[PDB]
Design a protein around this nucleic acid. Structure first.
Ligand SMILES: [Mg+2]
Ligand SMILES: [Mg+2]
Ligand SMILES: [Mg+2]
Ligand SMILES: [Mg+2]
Ligand SMILES: [Mg+2]
Ligand SMILES: [Mg+2]
Ligand SMILES: [Mg+2]
Ligand SMILES: [Mg+2]
Ligand SMILES: [Mg+2]
Ligand SMILES: [Mg+2]
Ligand SMILES: [Mg+2]
Ligand SMILES: [Mg+2]
Ligand SMILES: [Mg+2]
Ligand SMILES: [Mg+2]
Ligand SMILES: [Mg+2]
Ligand SMILES: [Mg+2]
Ligand SMILES: [Mg+2]
Ligand SMILES: [Mg+2]
Ligand SMILES: [Mg+2]
Ligand SMILES: [Mg+2]
Ligand SMILES: [Mg+2]
Lengths: 64, 130, 93, 86, 273
RNA sequence: GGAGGAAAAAUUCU
RNA sequence: GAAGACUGGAGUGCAGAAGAGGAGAGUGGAAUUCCACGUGUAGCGGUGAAAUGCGUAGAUAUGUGGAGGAACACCAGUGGCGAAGGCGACUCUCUGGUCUGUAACUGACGCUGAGGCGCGAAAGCGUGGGGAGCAAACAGGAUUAGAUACCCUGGUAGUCCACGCCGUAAACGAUGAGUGCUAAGUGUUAGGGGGUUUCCGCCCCUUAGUGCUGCAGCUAACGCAUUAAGCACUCCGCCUGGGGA
């Protein structure tokens, strides 16, 4: 039920922080849904933008 | 917007249907005249003029009879911006066969049907109320 | 406007050619109008998925403060011609 | 249109030391913006939403000019001669 | 663009032509002109060997630089002008030495630019480099086949090729016809597409406008005599009363492949058109 | 109860 | 009607916010098809059952490499933006609109709008490219009494790109635009203020959107009900028994 980003107060989700993004991606490199993690919608879409930019530059796995 | 007197009548009509006791709206000269007339014929109970530094407001208390009977049973607008209505001294109508009243603005100010027919003057009819 | 350009150099490039490419690009990025404020170097990292024939790469980061939007353009095309750079990205911070 | 550029437009056609709502400054800013969008539309032919924005501001400026004319004539003549309209 | 004519006359009804809005000057460089005389398809022996040629406007030849050997010297585009001997336009270049040379005008070339050639040249439209150092995927033109000979393969108006890969001593190229071919890596090429790409849309409109270009009428073989053409003869109109349509010299003309079957250059062609 | 997504089966006639 | 005066309407200023709003250029991965090469042998594909079809000239399958085109899995949500049609990969450049906060500024500068101008899914037309999948027309194999169909195997225009036409739809919320008044309960999107609280969090108040249940009221009924189909005013468009049409 708790978000994560709002609770800790962090506002900007950089696309270089791999460890933060690794928590919100599944075993086979899939973005987890919002109903499972509990992230707020605004930070959810910001996190997806960051994840896609990180993944596009050979830094997160597209598959597996 | 377009017609403030129609808004006045609609406000009283809605508050009367809801059985509201108090009503407030922005004030003007003609609004105060209509409220004073309605108070004279006893349709409403009391009216106050509250001073605010935009235009001023008027607050009317709706009056209900014993056992929750509505004193005011209807308001209709006659003169409209799209169609003005003017009545002569011998053409002024009797509202509800004398049971109700009409408001007419003649050269001597705003009056009711009885006053207009007593002085044999005519003007424009604003509304019927009964 | 503030930018941030982070790119990848091939893993087999020796130190001399790597640094030569580094100053070459840092020069061709500032000759068209730019005030470079930081050029760090992440270094050797693995790749989540492979590229043309490589599994590792040297990640390099540079931060810009140009207000003309043309220098970056030049970098783009040069980055698309040089075979030492395998991938690049420009992000407007 | 960057904010500072609009600031010089405001400062040039201001009526008194702190005037921002007079029709003069509004018409001047609108003229600058519509010139910029005319350039952009001349560049991009098939950007229709920006063209709707152009038409909206042109209509707004026309109503503003009509109001200024019906309020005062000398000020209207001065504006049309200074900014080169019609 | 393409100019269009009003139907003032029956011969002007369907004509279209260019507007020459890209042509800067109308006088050629006097020191690079040579005379041309019409051959009218006539042989070494005065015989007519190629039909439907002869009798147009007279022209003069422009010496055009196809080799592009002048390395390291910058050259400015001075003019873009008309050449009657080819479909594309040409450009006059003033090199820093003070000497002038003609090149084919590529698409996106305008007056005032600077054009280089050699190993140190950048990959810009108008420059010339060897194929060994041109990045894969670029669009090129004026490809040459033998090193030092001069540009020969892509030269018409609006045409362009593309680099597909490298095979060590050779480089793969996809020519304008869709044929993948191996070219020696030491040969040269010029970056960009040739620039008169509207040339395809011209409508001649008149019988006599073809004659200004040197094109005499062509007669169908079905309206000849049996001793003139295999299609000749017959009472009234006649169909092609043969197994296949045939050229005026025999040798079937529809679908018959005429490339030599034991040609040496067949090993350098990766896939046919 | 209402909204969204979504599988597997399938002969003809009266 | 004229001359003055004032901010509630309207607009600008100052500070923040969100978004698949639009145009241009470049790039990315998964998958399908085709081509070349290793391993390997008799079937593969398909249906309610079959057959046409591909395959010993060696398939289907599996591994490696190359070519090209179209669409963007997870995020994804009666979520968001736009006047409508509509808009889902990533980066940059050029641009339109909206919301909240303040009360600095002008002072009715507003609403609607016949005729005009412009935008407008898909299908279709003209010129030039591109063509991997799908697929009108078409052919074959089946079903059937017949099968100009549904089902199977292939397949051209078209679907894609640029410029120019066309101007239609169940173009629908089957509900024209503007303004104000009229019980509540409960989700969600973008903001603002206060109280609890070291923060987090929880609670209350308010603006603008988007869902559901429901009072008065309205309706022939179904039902609508602060996002009215309730109560009122301004302006436009349209209707007058079915077919012919
Ligand atoms: Mg001929
Ligand atoms: Mg002929
Ligand atoms: Mg004959
Ligand atoms: Mg013969
Ligand atoms: Mg014959
Ligand atoms: Mg005959
Ligand atoms: Mg022959
Ligand atoms: Mg359902
Ligand atoms: Mg306001
Ligand atoms: Mg295989
Ligand atoms: Mg004042
Ligand atoms: Mg109309
Ligand atoms: Mg279409
Ligand atoms: Mg077409
Ligand atoms: Mg089919
Ligand atoms: Mg219609
Ligand atoms: Mg309709
Ligand atoms: Mg309405
Ligand atoms: Mg709401
Ligand atoms: Mg309901
Ligand atoms: Mg109804």
């Amino acid at each position: 039920k708790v978000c994560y980003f709002t609770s800790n107060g962090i506002t900007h989700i950089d696309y270089k922080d791999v460890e933060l993004l690794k928590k919100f991606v599944s075993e086979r490199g899939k973005i987890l849904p919002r109903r499972v993690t509990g992230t707020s919608a605004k930070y959810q879409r910001k996190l997806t933008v960051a994840i896609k930019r990180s993944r596009q530059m050979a830094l997160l796995p597209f598959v597996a | 917007m377009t017609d403030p007197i129609a808004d006045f009548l609609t406000r009283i009509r809605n508050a009367n249907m809801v059985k509201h006791d108090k009503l407030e709206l922005p004030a003007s000269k003609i609004k105060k005249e209509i409220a004073e007339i309605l108070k004279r014929e006893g349709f409403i109970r009391d009216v106050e003029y509250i001073e605010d530094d935009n235009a001023g407001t008027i607050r009317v208390f709706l009056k209900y009879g014993a056992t929750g009977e509505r004193v005011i049973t209807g308001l209709k607008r006659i003169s409209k911006p799209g169609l003005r209505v003017y009545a002569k001294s011998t053409e002024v109508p009797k509202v509800l066969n004398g049971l109700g009243i009409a408001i007419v603005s003649t050269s001597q100010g705003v009056l009711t049907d009885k006053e207009a027919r007593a002085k044999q003057v005519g003007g424009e009819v604003l509304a019927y109320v009964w | 406007r503030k930018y941030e350009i982070m790119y990848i150099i091939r893993p087999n490039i020796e130190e001399d050619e790597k640094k030569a490419v580094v100053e070459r690009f840092d020069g061709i990025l500032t000759e068209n109008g730019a005030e470079i404020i930081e050029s760090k170097e992440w270094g050797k990292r693995r790749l989540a998925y492979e590229i043309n024939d490589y599994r590792d790469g040297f990640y390099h980061i540079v931060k810009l403060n140009a207000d003309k939007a043309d220098s970056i353009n030049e970098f783009d095309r040069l980055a698309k011609i040089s075979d030492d750079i395998v991938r690049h990205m420009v992000i407007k911070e | 249109l960057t904010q500072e550029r609009k600031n010089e437009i405001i400062a040039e056609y201001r009526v008194h030391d702190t005037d921002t709502g007079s029709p003069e400054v509004q018409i001047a800013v609108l003229t600058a913006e519509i010139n910029s969008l005319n350039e952009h539309v001349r560049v991009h032919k098939k950007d229709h939403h920006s063209y709707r924005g152009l038409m909206k501001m042109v209509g707004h400026r026309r109503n503003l000019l009509t109001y200024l004319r019906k309020k005062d004539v000398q000020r209207y003549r001065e504006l049309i001669k200074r900014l080169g309209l019609r | 663009a393409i100019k269009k004519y009003k139907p003032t006359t029956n011969g002007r009804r369907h004509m279209t032509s260019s507007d020459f809005a890209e042509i800067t000057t109308s006088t050629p460089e006097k020191s690079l002109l040579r005379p041309l005389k019409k051959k009218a398809g006539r042989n070494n022996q005065g015989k007519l060997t190629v039909r439907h040629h002869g009798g147009g406007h007279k022209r003069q030849y422009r010496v055009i630089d196809f080799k592009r050997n002048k390395d390291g010297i910058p050259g400015r585009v001075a003019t873009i002008e008309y050449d009657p001997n080819r479909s594309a336009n040409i450009a006059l270049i003033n090199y820093a030495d003070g000497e002038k040379r003609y090149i084919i005008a590529a698409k996106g070339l305008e007056v005032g630019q600077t054009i280089y050639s050699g190993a140190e040249a950048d990959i810009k439209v108008g420059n010339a480099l060897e194929l060994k150092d041109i990045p894969v995927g670029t669009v090129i033109h004026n490809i040459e086949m033998k090193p030092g000979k001069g540009g020969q393969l892509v030269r018409s108006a609006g045409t362009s090729a593309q680099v597909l890969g490298k095979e060590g001593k050779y480089v793969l190229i996809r020519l304008n016809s869709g044929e993948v071919r191996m070219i020696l890596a030491t040969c040269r090429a010029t970056i960009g597409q040739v620039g008169n790409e509207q040339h395809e849309l011209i409508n001649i409109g008149k019988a006599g406008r073809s004659r200004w270009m040197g094109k005499r009428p062509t007669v169908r073989g079905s309206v000849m005599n049996p001793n003139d053409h295999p299609h000749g003869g017959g009472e009234g109109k006649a169909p092609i009363g043969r197994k296949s349509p045939m050229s005026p010299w025999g040798k079937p003309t529809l679908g018959y492949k005429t490339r030599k079957k034991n040609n040496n250059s067949d090993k350098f062609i990766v896939r046919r058109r």
